[PDB]
Amino acid sequence: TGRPASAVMQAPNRAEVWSRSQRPRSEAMAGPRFEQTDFDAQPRPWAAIELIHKQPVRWTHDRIVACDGGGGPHGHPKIYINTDKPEIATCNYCGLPFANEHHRKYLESLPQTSYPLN
Amino acid sequence: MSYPTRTLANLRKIGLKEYFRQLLYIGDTKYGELVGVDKFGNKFYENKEELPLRTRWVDYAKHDYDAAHIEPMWHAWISYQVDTPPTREPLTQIERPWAPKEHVPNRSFTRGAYKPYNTTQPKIQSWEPKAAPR
Amino acid sequence: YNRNPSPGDNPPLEYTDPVTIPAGDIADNPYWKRDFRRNYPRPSVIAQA
Amino acid sequence: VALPKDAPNPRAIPREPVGEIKQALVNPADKYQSKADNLHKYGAWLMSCLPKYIQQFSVWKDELTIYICPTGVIPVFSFLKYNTNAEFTQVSDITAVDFPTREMRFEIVYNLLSVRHNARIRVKTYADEVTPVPSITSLYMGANWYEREVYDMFGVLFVGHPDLRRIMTDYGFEGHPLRKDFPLTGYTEIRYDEEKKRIVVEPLELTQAFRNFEGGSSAWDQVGPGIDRTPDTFKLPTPKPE
Amino acid sequence: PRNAPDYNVPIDIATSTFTPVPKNVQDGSEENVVPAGLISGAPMELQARTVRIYKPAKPATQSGEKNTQLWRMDWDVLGKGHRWENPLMGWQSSADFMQGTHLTFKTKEDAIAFAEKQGYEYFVQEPNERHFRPKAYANNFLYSPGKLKHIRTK
Amino acid sequence: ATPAGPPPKNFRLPPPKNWDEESESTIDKVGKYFLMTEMLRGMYVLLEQFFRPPYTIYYPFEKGPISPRFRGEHALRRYPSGEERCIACKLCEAVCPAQAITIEAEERADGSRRTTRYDIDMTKCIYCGFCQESCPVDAIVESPNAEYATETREELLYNKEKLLANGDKWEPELAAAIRADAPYR
Amino acid sequence: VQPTKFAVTVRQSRNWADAKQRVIAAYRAWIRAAPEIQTMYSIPFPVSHIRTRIRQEFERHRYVNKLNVVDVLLQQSNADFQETMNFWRQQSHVMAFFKEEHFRGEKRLPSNFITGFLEGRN
Amino acid sequence: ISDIHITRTGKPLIRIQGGRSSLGEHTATVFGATGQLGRYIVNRLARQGCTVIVPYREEMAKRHLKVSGDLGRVIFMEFDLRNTQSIEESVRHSDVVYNLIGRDYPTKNFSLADVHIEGTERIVEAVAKYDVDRFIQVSTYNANPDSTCEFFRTKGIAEKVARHVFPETTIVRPAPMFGFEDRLLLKLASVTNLFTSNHMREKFWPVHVNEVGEALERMLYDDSTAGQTFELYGPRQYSMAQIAELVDREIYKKRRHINLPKPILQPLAELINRVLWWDTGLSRDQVEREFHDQVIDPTAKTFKDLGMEPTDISKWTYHYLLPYRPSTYYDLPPSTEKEMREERKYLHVLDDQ
Amino acid sequence: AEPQDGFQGTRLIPTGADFQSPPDPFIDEGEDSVEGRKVRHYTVNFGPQHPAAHGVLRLILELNGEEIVRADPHVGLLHRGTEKLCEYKTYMQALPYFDRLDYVSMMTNEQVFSLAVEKLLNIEIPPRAKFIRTMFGEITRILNHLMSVLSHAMDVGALTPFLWGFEEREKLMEFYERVSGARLHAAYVRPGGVHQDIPVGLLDDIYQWATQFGDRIDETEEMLTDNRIWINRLKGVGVVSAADALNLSFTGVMLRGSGVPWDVRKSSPYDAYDQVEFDVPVGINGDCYDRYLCRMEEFRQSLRIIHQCLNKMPAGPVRYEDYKITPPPRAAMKENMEALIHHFLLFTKGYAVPPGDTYTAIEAPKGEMGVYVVSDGSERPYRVHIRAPGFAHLSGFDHITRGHLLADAVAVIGTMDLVFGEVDR
């Protein structure tokens, strides 16, 4: 029921679904109920998965890093992240990337990373 | 309920054209200082010598004025939920590239009305029949 | 004077969440001494016998 | 605005600082032990005065419960109404509780008030699907609607009740909704049908089924057995050593 | 006629397309049993459906045994009408008015007595019990006269 | 009726007074009757109110007061980076007194714990704030908005798209309301 | 009587002879009222069709051999009778009692095994 | 009759039979559902959990249709019969399309040919473009393209157009229908005077509108009704006079018809239709229609084929006209001697009040 | 040996009829003749479609000309199955169900359920919570009496006081919205205390409203108390004697109007009512006029209590300090392991309540409100039964109205403080 890009794109900043059980917008907004409708007027929030991966890697020398979202009481419960593996460590609440400085040369060697590194 | 001295004074401060226009939408003779303008073009005013809860008011940009036309942060200000107008509100300055750029009014009774739908895939998948050849 | 300032402009840092020191101490409050829920009275039942 | 001369800004008065707040730990059950003996004595005296019908009594905090057989409902409530030391002349509430594990599944609960003595009492009897209870409408006019509610929600008959009919459910409603075996959304539902030009009853069909999170109940008991608070005047003596 | 389904039972207003055909409806003449299902107001369907009477097993994910203490009475899910996907929201619709109902009993004779009285068909699942075996910490360190056969790691 | 013990002092009323014993003169008695003095006094009260300021505000040009705690239209919020705050704990779905929330979740493509379905049936919701109280990350909140009456009931079945768009539009209010009341939460 | 029009005080039956009189008395009042019931709720059926339903309702409980259960059924009959003869019921309530006026029919269960199986459990 | 329906084009419909929340699987468009008969087909589909597309012209007119279905089941579409985009936006998702669009009088905007012939032709062409499975076209009794009567004539060509564009068209020929909100029973029972230029001598076999609506539903379920034609009529023939006898027999009022002669009434009927802005029940082609007599085609499927037995109109007059019989105390027949005697057991005035 | 003993009907159970004693006759004070002619009564339905005094009320009256013969209220038009739903909720989840019973007296409704659950929890709530709940209790009593007295006045024709007093309602509804985020259904009083503390400028704003509320009461009394039309509409109407009021289950003003000095706040003190001073208005003639005067004086005693609560408000926590019952502060929940677990469990499982049962009553604005809760030891209540004063009062409508004029029925419907969410639940 949708020709325009608002009716096909999963989000303005991402064409594709980001979970296996996610219904593609093209099939979700199809059928009789979407016939005489403005599609740009429909709610289409930006995909959070694309936005969090623009966040640069917060480098640290310490092995363990605390993350609470940065709002103090306005964030998430404080958790502690281990950066000892040679990879980008990510907060399981807010998705923020963290990496140890010991792994900077190997991470810079990597062809493509999950996070910009800069 | 304006009273003579109030209405006569506001008339002098605003002029008869403005007076009659104000009488065409709000039905009162109000005058105050311009606090600011929102994204949709609504103008917001304050006067602390008015009656309680009448010290803040909006002049709507659109003839068919609707209460949902008010920009979010201004909605808090006019409803006395905050005292700092959005013109001085730091939380209005955080850059959110995902934030809606044009104002979002209520879209009911139009063809932009929100249509709900299932956001998930079917729970069960049937076999795709493959007749084996003889 | 009335609702001035608006409650939405009350400075958040001023208000302090209070803690009573027996219940909220870090030193001398074992939970079992103030566990009045688990010390609930059983009903006292008397039959004809 | 024109302010009142003697009404200054009440927010502008500074408040004295508050420091280390200290609140003692209170067991709220302790304050009732002062009357624990008296409540047992009153229950015991009632049992002695009406031994033919009073099976047991219980005292929890300041609440005295009296447990009776259904046949004694009229004699027991007559005594609680008219006795000079029991002037429970108001029925606060009559209701029922369902216990399917019991043969007499219905527990009938009466709460009484004595304004003269500033006291309350609870009387419990039991009933079944086919075993009625005496109506107390001849002793208390207020009891009339409470018994209709028990009959409506639980299906309990009150013999001697005038005009025992439904009070809460729709006319022609089938079932007693406060039974544990009666399901939450019931059996049927209504709608307006445009062919019949009237409302029609149909089998119940929910667009979203009720989700029962009862299975999230803690796998560990969280309350424990509690504390015994029987007074000494109602505990048996013990043999001395040697 | 020896568990034959009575295709001529009278219906009531709650009889739907998902109601099973009963075998035995109460008439008030059963010996020694109160016919609650005849007077309860409950639909004919509950005398056509089977309940399960069992002690819930301890979850494999926890050691607490609180929910294994009591006897549970539960209705079996039918072939049709228990759940389906609502086309609008994807919610899960039901035609089974007993789906979210369970009863708790102190003993299974109580559960059986209630089920016989209402006229439910029932099936009693007895609880599997643990087989006792004494355990000793010192068995972690028994002397092995022969090849070790297993290397323990505390 | 009276409490046990001796009758309260002076509980018994004195005997009724006859017409003869009334301590009020005939002229006053006749005058009030024929002149309707207390009715005239009540009318005079209305004139006093006739010249007092009215309490009326001119809605929708003016609005009544609301607090940072006000419970209105639901919204889903983000972090400053734009990542969803919601991690599919299901605390709001469990506490909901009306069963208005339905949630489904799996691992996202990046392995993050996120929702795939987040619906709120606004025709089931009792606007109690329990979800907002139960949320450990401030993901579900009630906005101050109350002016969203709809033409059809289907427009009140909010899915995740509708709720995340609401959070994007209302975020500066949502942060201001959280900023003012978080010390008390 | 005294509380409202058709109010019957709840009493137990003394014996089976007492119970039978009440059951016949209850049936007699029901089938007598059938002409009034038709015109009072504008039922689109003849009094013959209504009176048959009365007998079947009494025949579902013909085999009851327990006195306490009879007292329960008698109390239900009086309650239904009062709320019918008083215009407390609405046409929707009485019409729902006639199983023919459901848009899926009156034979709401499968005739035999194979019709229910071919349609999908009825 | 089962959990599986396979449509003309093969779609399997796994259906959960039930009520409002159930899954009927069919998507239907019903043109002209805002009239007398459209409420019985829309109601039957929606309450089985089928999706019904309702194209409408006046918003306030279609408001009652939404109550039939669950949320998301009754869908409204703004439409004009001369807006092709609107017709085929209402049809491209449907597996069955009902055409109930008709009008007994011409209007300033629509001739009988414009609404029937051109109306069907745009709809039927939309049906074939999107390969709708079943296109049920509703028509009239006496539908014949060689008739002088434009009503019957324009119902004739539209049959031929529909069957040409879409050979599997199912044509339904209902006789004048009675029932709730009909124009037979209430028209006789309500208007003080009728201008009938034939002494109410036209005969026909009235059929309940409920049964026509039920029949329309039954054709959806059997694929054997495609390419067929259905004359749908009641058991016994009546005439407008004999039915008026029943009406008068039930409301205790005497019918009065002026009965102006045909050469004078017919031009007047034209004038009234061109100056009054509503259905006056009177027009030129309607005066001509009253001389015609319903002739039933013998080579057309009946209710028999659908497993139905129409009821006679005299069974329904009392039900549908009961709220129109006076019930004032002034109008009861005289008191019996039994009644005269019992009055003397009561005081008939309160003397203390 | 029941109920098989009833299978063949032995030993009928004794009724109240089997205990009717003949009165002592010594001291017991109690042809076509037109006197034998019967009088036919006409039975009129009032409501809910045809306008009534207020609410979902189908009142079926048998009349003799202008006089009431039998009064038969049909209720259940607002029966929503609240008591059954509470068995599928946690104690937290059942609390909002109490806002919607007497839905102009929300905080005292939730107060009675909190006190009953606190009693089975065996916890003593902090002193500040006690004073906040008592303070909001009397604010809610004024809100209720403003609705009750003035809408009762509007029913008998007095339009103006209803307009004046509902601006007072608007001012006090702001206090409800400032503490919670709701005008009506605050869900503010919970077992353990109150949801959150009051904002730091509320007490002074309540105080400012308090300095002007006495004048609002007085101006209401200027239109009604001495008005001869008001007196002639209320005096001698809806009389119930002190003895019958007790036997009919009448509580609150319906009981105190008949001369019985009884207030639950005095007889069984709860929260902070033992720490405050107030008087109990009591009538002597048991009529609508006495009950109107008691309610007007209750306005002044409520304001008198509120002023004492403003000055006696202590510092400290507003929620019982055990995170096994009350939710931890959000900063604690995001900071330490123990608090986060207790937050998770309280919002998914709920707190477990020790097994037992209790009947707990308060002096609600409409009279004695009680709740009977049975706990099975789990996190869901086994049984919640609500004792609504309006249920007992409306059950007495026939007793107080039989033999009286149809033109007085609106007076006694209004003299009972009747909200049908209370009556039907």
Ligand SMILES: NC(=O)C1=CN([C@@H]2O[C@H](COP(=O)(O)OP(=O)(O)OC[C@H]3O[C@@H](n4cnc5c(N)ncnc54)[C@H](OP(=O)(O)O)[C@@H]3O)[C@@H](O)[C@H]2O)C=CC1
């Ligand atoms: N009723 C009878 O006894 C008989 C009827 N028929 C046929 O039966 C079918 C249904 O009959 P019935 O329901 O009683 O008829 P109605 O007159 O009650 O309804 C006819 C429908 O056609 C629609 N319609 C008419 N003209 C137009 C137009 N120009 N453009 C768009 N829509 C239009 C109307 O919509 P709107 O409401 O907006 O005008 C209405 O929904 C019709 O095809 C009719 O000709 C034939 C023989 C007998």
Ligand code: SF4
């Ligand atoms: S909104 Fe909050 S409470 Fe609900 S699932 Fe998301 S994170 Fe958990």
Ligand code: SF4
């Ligand atoms: S506000 Fe209350 S009812 Fe509404 S979704 Fe949140 S928890 Fe559920």
Ligand SMILES: [Zn+2]
């Ligand atoms: Zn983080």
